[PDB]
Amino acid sequence: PIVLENGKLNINIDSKTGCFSVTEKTSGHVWKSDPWENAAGLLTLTDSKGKKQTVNISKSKKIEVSKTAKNTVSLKFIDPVFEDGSVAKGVSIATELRLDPNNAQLDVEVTEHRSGNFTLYDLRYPARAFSLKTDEDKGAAVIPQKQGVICPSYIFPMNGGRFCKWDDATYNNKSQGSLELFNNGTGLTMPWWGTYNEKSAVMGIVDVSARPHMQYNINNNGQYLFNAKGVMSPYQRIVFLDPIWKLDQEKGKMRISYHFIPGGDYVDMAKVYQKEAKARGHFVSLQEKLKRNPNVNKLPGAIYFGIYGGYPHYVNMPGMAFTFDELKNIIKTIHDDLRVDKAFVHAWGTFSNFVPHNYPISEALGGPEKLKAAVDLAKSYGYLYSSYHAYSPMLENDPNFTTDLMQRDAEGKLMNTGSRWARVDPKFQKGLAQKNIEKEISYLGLEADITDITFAAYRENGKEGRIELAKYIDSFNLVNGTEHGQEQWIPYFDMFEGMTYLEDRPLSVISHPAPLFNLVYHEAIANFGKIQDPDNEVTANGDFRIKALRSMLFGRGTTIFFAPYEFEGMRPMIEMARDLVSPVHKETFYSELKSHEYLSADYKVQRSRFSSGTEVIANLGPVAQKIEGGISIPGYGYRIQMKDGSLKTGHFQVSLHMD
Amino acid sequence: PIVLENGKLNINIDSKTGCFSVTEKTSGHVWKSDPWENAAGLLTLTDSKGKKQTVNISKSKKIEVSKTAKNTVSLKFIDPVFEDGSVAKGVSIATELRLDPNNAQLDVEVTEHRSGNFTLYDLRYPARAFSLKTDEDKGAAVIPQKQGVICPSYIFPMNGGRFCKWDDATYNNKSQGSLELFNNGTGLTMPWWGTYNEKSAVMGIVDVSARPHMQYNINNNGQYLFNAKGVMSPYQRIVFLDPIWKLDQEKGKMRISYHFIPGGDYVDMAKVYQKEAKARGHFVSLQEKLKRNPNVNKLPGAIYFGIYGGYPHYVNMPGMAFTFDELKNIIKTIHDDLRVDKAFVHAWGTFSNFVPHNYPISEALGGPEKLKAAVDLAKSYGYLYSSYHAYSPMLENDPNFTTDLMQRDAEGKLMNTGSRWARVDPKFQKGLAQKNIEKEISYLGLEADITDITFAAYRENGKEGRIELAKYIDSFNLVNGTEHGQEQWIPYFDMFEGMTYLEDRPLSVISHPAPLFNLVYHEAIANFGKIQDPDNEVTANGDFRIKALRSMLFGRGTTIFFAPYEFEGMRPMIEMARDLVSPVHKETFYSELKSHEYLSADYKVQRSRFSSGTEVIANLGPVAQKIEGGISIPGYGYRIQMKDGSLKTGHFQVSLHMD
């Protein structure tokens, strides 16, 4: 065996297979190679008859493993072998393992691939590495899926219904699959993932130039590999996360940097990526943003209100659209009746054309002067205000619809025919914003802006146009926000609407929400609930009780998103948000989320600590549970230590009034 | 154009295409043929090169339409033409349209298909028929997806977040697809579906011998047909539901009977099917079941308690398993402290072997005598009791695991390797129940039984074994329930645990729950909430507020499903169910659900009328809303007229307790 070693790690590379193990020398923990098939990597390629096949590259005809430098091992897998015994003659995969001379860091890189007469698709490399043994390791996979989740590597007590779904999912296809980087759907918002047990943690950070997918396997024994054969899997239940290098598409550097943390968990992983986040330029603190714009301080303790008038989906829809007089009266009631001290008022439906033509201010809704009166009222309260804006849609029901503003692919076919909200080519969108945004800022005297859709993902295609638009909006120095966000956009915005959780999502029945994104970026970007899943709606992600408590634990602001006719039904939740969440949001707004912990066996009792000196303990389940010292946290209850040392305790109650 | 006609319907058939329209003469509404491509049918078949393709059979080389009897039109489609212009020589499809002499019923049947050298797969016939024009017809598709849903054919006011998800789904792939009949997953529980507008309704009943799939299209303009071509759809947004005849599989009669109802909606459709359900033998009323077994009357007003001890998933799991003394104390507390007058206690975890070996009563949990003390206490209260039973699983973690009792297919491959709870061939399952169920009945003096899994679906494979097991269980004459159920199993059981809603399901963001199954079968089978989505858990289907109100509107009983450690947190929901749901469930239990109505434009206020003289009005949304007479229904509120003349009014309230 070839050995790479420094003061902290020993890398044992098998010269016959290319598989490697990593010994973390201070804990003695040994991270293993693929426990199922001893595969260094899993390559998907076409065979001589053209059918896609997936092969173990450790079964290649020739495997070369040599130490080409002091801390570098080069590997070459030559002529993989198909299941029928034929050979992909002329296919080769070259990789490298590079141990940092000093730190507990191992770089793994696919350096070259040769495809011969075959076509190469996916490469899982390293394959099924750094795994946890289910119900032996007591730890978790760590996945920054949107705000982030952990997946425990063992079965634990929980509500009986949740338990049945959890355990069942670890045995069927719900616990295996892949996710992508930097989308607003089911995918990841940070280019890292990892695993930990009680002894140590490992995480891999993907090179800034690459876009692998992430394969997950959450306590599954690989039965999915044998269902088509109709045999029972002979493998052990394990947790693993693998990079999927898309050899057919990838033109970046196929490198992942593994960091090994003794005694670490998801918090320590986030802090390690935080250092890389700063080096990549994503991290621009809220304090720097506040120095540039003092109106940023209208955000701490503010409730985000979206008054949804059926727009952009429809123009002046009956029964949903608000007039500007009705808009003004809602703002007045929020301030005078509901005593909301700080607010971001977001009015969806102020223009008489469909987006992307965000103008003129609608005469049918009352006209420019009536909208200005509503905005002037909000500004007299110290509220932030923005209308709904979007420069990316191209809607079938718009009379101005045209494919001329749409993008076409290499075949000349229209792109995003099935995604109406992102049909305009980003290279056109600054020009669209330029048509009226400066007129609206000037006329209404705007201090804030929120822009929809365009910055919800970070894809390569069109990024230059999106950066152009981001720079244009940011040049106005308004307190600005955007839908969902991604880390690459943090320098340009003050708040993200979203960066929480999809309602329907892979892993939902076998994961726990964890504030991975905010553990990295809470100092640099404020987030609020997503408008489709706001704190006033009851969804897979909870009711107001659960969402308010998770808000304080994770460091996000309250979102109240409603059609005008619902307003009277919103008052009780606006009041509870004002009383409970807003003061904590205010105190913690600029701080670092230093730590998050799970404090109960069922993961429902959690504790967050912010660098403001604020501590939030909350219990997101129905039954009172005790923590260290025998302190009891009531069901749907909280125990909050404020910066001045005062202690807030309480709980939500659902009751039935009968006349 | 060939015409079939009686006093109630005019059927207009086009001689060139085979498309037909139906004029419903009482209202004058005309059901048009395929508004998109003038396709009588859509046939999926392989071409001369073996590529699957889908063709418009109205483009066939020869189409023959002849009136072959007084009320029969025969159609033949000969030699379909592919996209390239090649002919499928030797392929033909023969159909018939048969108008009933007196009634507004039209039978449509695929009588014959010939493949030649090609292979035929799916036939949509009739294609895109009985459609609604989006935002023109105000009405809905009607789909018995589990308990049932309707899908409005027009946009309407609703919560802003819901509105965005709803409308977006009508423009992407969430609003098109297919469902299957008689599964416990995403599919249909009754073999019919329909569409209605403000003038007229049509519904189709699938022949008892057939198993088509159901294609749905909910306000989609067919963009999914064009995304791969990268062009915009030229078609209108419409709602349709189509049969998908599986020509490669179907051995039954490929017939669907359409019934036409002037002024009808989903209630009328359900009552039409209720007649057919009695003809099919499914309908055995709860009153006859009570005549056979007086203890059935322990069910009305009973809360279904599932005490989930981590079993069947694990044997004596630490932190989840209950002892029999602990079980007895939970029962005592439910009765003496929580004052629950009627209950079905279901104890998950009483045996020391894994299912399918439901024995012996566990010594580790306390032994048979202590279990008997728990059951005797429950019986002294008048409660029903059952242990958890299952005869279908074969679990990887069972020391007794063997493939001996699993089914194999013609190639010798194990079946259900991907579905651990349903692996024992049903032909063995009665034998497995015979091992101990009679010993448990006589030792514990059981009055009740619940059996898991085996009756959650109705597939052809193994149904004879399942009937054998159901007949055996029914021969004991216990008050008996089963998981989920299907209409074919109603004769053998008193209650179904489930028959409500999956949490994540196709159409969830573009449909409203409707009590379609209970509109048919409430007099014949009692149902309770599903254990994975019980009334004490907050999910996509609501919190306790929403679920308790829906329970009374739909006519189902409360389900409280909890791990033992959660019990103290269940107290407030048990009390609220006891005071609000239980008296209404008790009164309406044996009755017909005569009618259901949506009374608000957002469909959140609803009214159900039961033949016991009970009227339930409830508001499943947060804001108070007015109905006829200016009566106001509070948010999460109810107005219930009882048989004894009392009017129950009230509402749920969430309150924040800050100490």
Ligand SMILES: O[C@H]1[C@@H]2CNC[C@H]1OC2
């Ligand atoms: O997990 C599921 C499975 C089937 N029925 C409900 C639960 O129990 C076994």
Ligand SMILES: O[C@H]1[C@@H]2CNC[C@H]1OC2
């Ligand atoms: O429906 C969605 C779409 C994108 N942003 C949120 C909502 O508004 C437009």
Ligand SMILES: [Cl-]
């Ligand atoms: Cl959150």
Ligand SMILES: [Cl-]
């Ligand atoms: Cl229900």
Ligand code: NA
């Ligand atoms: Na999957």
Ligand code: NA
């Ligand atoms: Na800004």
Ligand code: NA
């Ligand atoms: Na779909």
Ligand code: NA
């Ligand atoms: Na019975």
